[PDB]
Design a protein around this ligand. Structure first.
Ligand SMILES: COc1ccc(C(=O)NCC(N)=O)cc1
Ligand SMILES: COc1ccc(C(=O)NCC(N)=O)cc1
Ligand SMILES: [Cl-]
Length: 163
């Protein structure tokens, strides 16, 4: 574990992380996709060998020795708010099991079920609270990667609020 487990947020490309493993905002089919998924595909394409996995699950594939944890958040265009919420919580619980299993001291993570999976809605608070619920019991340093200047501020405030 980390000596004093922490949360941090950075506004930059998760493909340039300084952590021991990465969480991909994957699709269920292991396709290159767009946004974070496409950035992960460009940096670690070997990790998309048999990466397909259902909604609400996480599947780890090694790129060399570097673990990519493919986490599949629901697409809120297809799910009810109720069922979407349940699957988004579940995907994060599966990320926490994999981070633990791998024995890493740090993990880079994006906010799942945002952007194209958001169903046209700001889900910063919903996605961040499910991330905390899952990762609070892990001792890895968690570095959250974001792509909105306002989101960086709000995520940073939510981390400080709890400390
Ligand atoms: C390539 O990864 C990133 C990382 C961050 C951003 C971003 O913050 N864009 C919105 C803005 N410039 O306010 C975009 C892409
Ligand atoms: C109002 O609909 C939306 C839908 C999606 C977002 C969102 O995820 N923004 C952050 C990002 N692009 O990473 C915000 C608002
Ligand atoms: Cl960058």
């Amino acid at each position: 574990g980390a000596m004093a487990p922490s949360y941090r947020v950075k506004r930059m490309d998760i493909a340039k992380n300084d952590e021991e493993c990465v969480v991909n905002a994957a699709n269920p089919r292991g396709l290159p996709g767009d946004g974070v998924c496409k950035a992960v595909y460009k940096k670690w394409p070997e990790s998309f060998k048999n990466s397909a996995t259902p909604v609400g699950t996480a599947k780890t594939v090694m790129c060399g020795t570097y673990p990519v944890i493919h986490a599949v958040g629901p697409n809120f265009s297809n799910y009810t708010e109720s069922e979407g919420d349940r699957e988004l919580a579940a995907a994060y619980r599966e990320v926490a099991k994999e981070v633990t299993r791998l024995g890493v001291n740090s993990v880079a993570i994006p906010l799942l079920s945002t952007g194209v999976y958001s169903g046209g809605k700001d889900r910063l608070t919903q996605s961040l609270n499910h991330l905390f619920t899952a990762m609070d019991s892990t001792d890895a340093d968690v570095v959250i990667y974001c792509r909105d200047k306002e989101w960086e501020k709000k995520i940073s405030e939510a981390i400080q609020m709890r400390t």
